[PDB]
Amino acid sequence: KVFGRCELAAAMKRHGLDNYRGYSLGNWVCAAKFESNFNTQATNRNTDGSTDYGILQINSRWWCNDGRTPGSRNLCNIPCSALLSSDITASVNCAKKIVSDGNGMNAWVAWRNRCKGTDVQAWIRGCRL
Numbered sequence: 001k002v003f004g005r006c007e008l009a010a011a012m013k014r015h016g017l018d019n020y021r022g023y024s025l026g027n028w029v030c031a032a033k034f035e036s037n038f039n040t041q042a043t044n045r046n047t048d049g050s051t052d053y054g055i056l057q058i059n060s061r062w063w064c065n066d067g068r069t070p071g072s073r074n075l076c077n078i079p080c081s082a083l084l085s086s087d088i089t090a091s092v093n094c095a096k097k098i099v100s101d102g103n104g105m106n107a108w109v110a111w112r113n114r115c116k117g118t119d120v121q122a123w124i125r126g127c128r129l
């Protein structure tokens with residue numbers, strides 16, 4: 001599924017991501033925008049052989065099992081395929097663990113490079129939330 005901007009903001013809020021670990025909803029929408037263009041089916045292979053999955057491009061290196069990332073962990077205890085669902089629950093639950101891991105949303109390099117310190121409120125502006 002390709003989410004609308006306000007549609008995704010509303011799902012993220014429903015799943016308790018708005019201000020999770022102090023990160024406003026705008027931050028999560030911004031990160032999803034640049035990670036996946038809001039497309040739940042986004043996959044991208046990394047140079048190291050790991051793969052990023054879903055709206056927030058969660059990496060098989062640590063967070064999900066895809067059976068093809070040697071020496072990797074599955075800290076969210078999910079198949080990476082669960083992260084491609086039109087239902088964002090698994091992505092949201094796993095992102096909660098990732099953002100709690102010590103570096104906050106810096107875990108998402110695109111968030112650091114494209115969202116951090118910007119007017120992230122723009123990403124939820126006009127949305128009925």
Ligand SMILES: [Cl-]
Nearest residue numbers: 004005033038
């Ligand atoms: Cl947009």
Ligand SMILES: [Cl-]
Nearest residue numbers: 024026120121
């Ligand atoms: Cl915001």
Ligand SMILES: [Cl-]
Nearest residue numbers: 064065073074
């Ligand atoms: Cl596993």
Ligand SMILES: [Cl-]
Nearest residue numbers: 067068069070
């Ligand atoms: Cl693996």
Ligand SMILES: [Cl-]
Nearest residue numbers: 072073074075
């Ligand atoms: Cl593991």
Ligand SMILES: [Cl-]
Nearest residue numbers: 065078079080
């Ligand atoms: Cl699995």
Ligand SMILES: [Cl-]
Nearest residue numbers: 011086087088
């Ligand atoms: Cl959903």
Ligand SMILES: [Cl-]
Nearest residue numbers: 021103104105
């Ligand atoms: Cl933080």
Ligand code: NA
Nearest residue numbers: 060064072073
């Ligand atoms: Na893995």
